[PDB]
From Swiss-Prot, chain A:
Protein's recorded name: ATP synthase F(1) complex subunit alpha, mitochondrial
Site label Required for activity, positions: S115
Taxonomic lineage of the native organism: Eukaryota, Metazoa, Chordata, Craniata, Vertebrata
Species this protein is from: Bos taurus (Bovine)
Function: Subunit alpha, of the mitochondrial membrane ATP synthase complex (F(1)F(0) ATP synthase or Complex V) that produces ATP from ADP in the presence of a proton gradient across the membrane which is generated by electron transport complexes of the respiratory chain. ATP synthase complex consist of a soluble F(1) head domain - the catalytic core - and a membrane F(1) domain - the membrane proton channel. These two domains are linked by a central stalk rotating inside the F(1) region and a stationary peripheral stalk.
N6-acetyllysine: residues carrying this PTM: K7
Modified residues (N6-succinyllysine): K7
Residue window of the full protein shown: 299 to 426 of 553
Gene this chain is encoded by: ATP5F1A
Other facts noted in the record for this chain: The siderophore enterobactin (Ent) produced by enteric bacteria binds Fe(3+) and helps bacteria scavenge iron ions from the environment. As a consequence, the mammalian siderocalin LCN2 plays an important role in defense against bacterial infections by sequestering iron bound to microbial siderophores. LCN2 can also bind iron bound to endogenous or nutrient-derived iron chelators and plays an important role in cellular iron homeostasis.
Family per record: Belongs to the ATPase alpha/beta chains family.
Compartments it resides in: Mitochondrion inner membrane; Cell membrane
Post-translational modification: Acetylated on lysine residues. BLOC1S1 is required for acetylation.
Residues that, per the record, bind Mg(2+): D14
Tissue: Heart muscle (at protein level). Heart and liver.
Swiss-Prot record, chain B:
Protein name per the record: ATP synthase F(1) complex subunit gamma, mitochondrial
Localisation: Mitochondrion inner membrane
Modification N6-acetyllysine, positions: K14, K30
Span of the entire protein shown here: 26 to 80 of 298
Family under the similarity heading: Belongs to the ATPase gamma chain family.
Top-level taxon: Eukaryota
Modified residues (N6-succinyllysine): K24
Role: Subunit gamma, of the mitochondrial membrane ATP synthase complex (F(1)F(0) ATP synthase or Complex V) that produces ATP from ADP in the presence of a proton gradient across the membrane which is generated by electron transport complexes of the respiratory chain. ATP synthase complex consist of a soluble F(1) head domain - the catalytic core - and a membrane F(1) domain - the membrane proton channel. These two domains are linked by a central stalk rotating inside the F(1) region and a stationary peripheral stalk.
Swiss-Prot record, chain C:
Name this polypeptide is given: ATPase inhibitor, mitochondrial
Function: Endogenous F(1)F(o)-ATPase inhibitor limiting ATP depletion when the mitochondrial membrane potential falls below a threshold and the F(1)F(o)-ATP synthase starts hydrolyzing ATP to pump protons out of the mitochondrial matrix. Required to avoid the consumption of cellular ATP when the F(1)F(o)-ATP synthase enzyme acts as an ATP hydrolase. Indirectly acts as a regulator of heme synthesis in erythroid tissues: regulates heme synthesis by modulating the mitochondrial pH and redox potential, allowing FECH to efficiently catalyze the incorporation of iron into protoporphyrin IX to produce heme.
Start and end residues of each stretch annotated as Disordered: 1-20
Mutagenesis / variant outcome for changing L38A: Strongly impairs F(1)F(o)-ATP synthase-binding
Domain notes: Forms an alpha-helical dimer with monomers associated via an antiparallel alpha-helical coiled coil composed of residues 74-106, leaving each N-terminal inhibitory region (residues 26-62) accessible for interaction with an F1 catalytic domain. The inhibitory N-terminal region (residues 26-62) binds the alpha(ADP-bound)-beta(ADP-bound) (ATP5F1A-ATP5F1B) interface of F1-ATPase, and also contact the central gamma subunit (ATP5F1C).
Disulfide bond annotation, renumbered to this chain: none
Effect recorded for Y26A: Strongly impairs F(1)F(o)-ATP synthase-binding
Resulting phenotype, R25A: No effect on F(1)F(o)-ATP synthase-binding
Organism of origin: Bos taurus (Bovine)
Effect annotated for changing E23A: Strongly impairs F(1)F(o)-ATP synthase-binding
Region annotated N-terminal inhibitory region, chain positions: 1-20
Site (Participates in pH sensing): E19, H42
Subcellular location: Mitochondrion
Amino acid sequence: YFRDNGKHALIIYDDLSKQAVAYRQMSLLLRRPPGREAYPGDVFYLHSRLLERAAKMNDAFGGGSLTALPVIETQAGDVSAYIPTNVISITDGQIFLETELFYKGIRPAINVGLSVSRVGSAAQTRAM
Amino acid sequence: ATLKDITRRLKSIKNIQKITKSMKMVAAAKYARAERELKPARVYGVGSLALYEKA
Amino acid sequence: VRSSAGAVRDAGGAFGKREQAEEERYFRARAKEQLAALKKHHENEIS
């Protein structure tokens, strides 16, 4: 609504790894056949159709925007898991938080080595 | 960890073990040579110290 | 299960980072030396 009415919005799904679990429970109780790790087949779609709504409308469509900051939770840093990889291949950037950095004193634990942002140059003030 | 983590770690440790075995062999050869060359130098140096402990 | 060349830096454990640093420090030093020599040659070859 906000992005369609020329305003700007920010949405923070927290977590998406629990929406995936709720969807899996629904799908298993409707008797739909399971998939990998028991998640339904349509588990990528579930998220891709959801994170694709965070657009940046041009000035003809109001100019409004909707940023999204999905939060995923990995297991012992296994970024290679199923839902983490799906959402990593869906989103633009990433912000890797690591426990080894959290306890080494670096807080926020952002792992600047791996953290990425496709926009990069653009969307940054000239001084910064 | 997962299977790939364990596989990579196992391969790395196997390489490390190979390298340390090779280095042990090299060090043993160099040690044998060093002992062989140390005997005469042992007598020579002990002689050179002779004076101070005698006077 | 076997082992292959260049596996210590594929795991990326402690030995991988240790080796990467042991390489980078040495080659930074040699690059500094070579740059100094390059500057000296530049100056000595102007004439």
